[PDB]
């Protein structure tokens, strides 16, 4: 007899009274890439000659991760 | 006898009294790329010669990942 | 005998007292990319050549990812 | 008796055997100024809040400057 | 009696064989000026917050200044 | 009695036998300016905030300067 019982009571939590001012102000740049042949199998993932900017201010932004198994 | 039984009562949560003043402003930029041949396959990811931005503020934005596996 | 019976009975929840005040203001910029050959297969995803901006405030923005699985 | 009798004879003179070939290519950017009063008079010549882009390619492009005064 | 006579008989020249091949490129930039009153009298000259860029290729580009004077 | 009489015989010159493959690629940049007044009389000359780029090429470039005076 096999029983797979895992019970799960967890709490992920936040309180912030004002979230703000936030100033992100970048000066440009220069990106130069040179190559003669590319190639890509199996799950390759590829980021070539970039110059990108990000912002990101979440209220909350909590996470939770599961894995539950079982195998014979 | 299997049972697979896993219970999950879990929290994710936020507060936030009030979100925002926030300010996106990138001066510019260059970007170059160079090839002769590209040649791509089983599930390649690509990204080439890019200048990209992005502001991203959600009010929660909280996240909750499960997996529930049996095999036999 | 077999039985599968996983209980959620999870939350994943949010509060913000007020959303806005949001600027986004990019400068622009310049790209350029040079090839001679392209060959693309199977499940390629694939960008070359980009120079684009997103502002994303959604009031909630919560995700939750389910995968329940069963095999003999 | 008064005589003024400058003799110019000279030459500012070019050769090129050929002219061309040129890339200006400028990435972009951002420029913010503030004020709260003005107040320009008597020959104020003045530029705020700028962002000009020149080519300028003369085939010859030669200067002579004169001047010639006589006072009693 | 009183004879003012300079004689110019000069030269200023040049030779080039081929001009060109030239890559002007910038990455963009940021400029951010504050004030409150600005106040400009006789003869003033100006420039306040720029971001300005210049390519210039004259095939000769050569310069002469002169000046002659006479006074009681 | 007064005679004023130089004699200008010179020569400035050059020879290039071939001028290029000339590159300008700055990478961006950042300022910033803090200022309550400003008070410009008799001829100022003035710069505030700047982020600027000169490519000069000319093929000869030469330049000569002359002043004569007589004063009495």
Same mark, same amino acid.
Do not use: W
């Given at each position: 007899? /096999?029983?797979? %019982?895992?019970?799960? #009571?967890? !709490?992920?939590?936040? %309180?912030?009274?004002?979230?703000?001012? /936030?100033?992100? !102000?970048?000066?440009?740049?220069?990106?130069?890439? !040179?190559?003669? +042949?590319? $190639?890509? +199998? $199996?799950?390759?993932?590829?980021? /070539?000659?970039?110059?990108?900017? /990000?912002?990101?201010?979440?209220?909350?932004?909590?996470? +939770?991760?599961?894995?539950? !198994? #079982?195998?014979?």
């Amino acid at each position: 007899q /096999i029983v797979y %019982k895992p019970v799960d #009571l967890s !709490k992920v939590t936040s %309180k912030c009274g004002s979230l703000g001012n /936030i100033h992100h !102000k970048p000066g440009g740049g220069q990106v130069e890439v !040179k190559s003669e +042949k590319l $190639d890509f +199998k $199996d799950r390759v993932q590829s980021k /070539i000659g970039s110059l990108d900017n /990000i912002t990101h201010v979440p209220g909350g932004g909590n996470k +939770k991760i599961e894995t539950h !198994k #079982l195998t014979f």
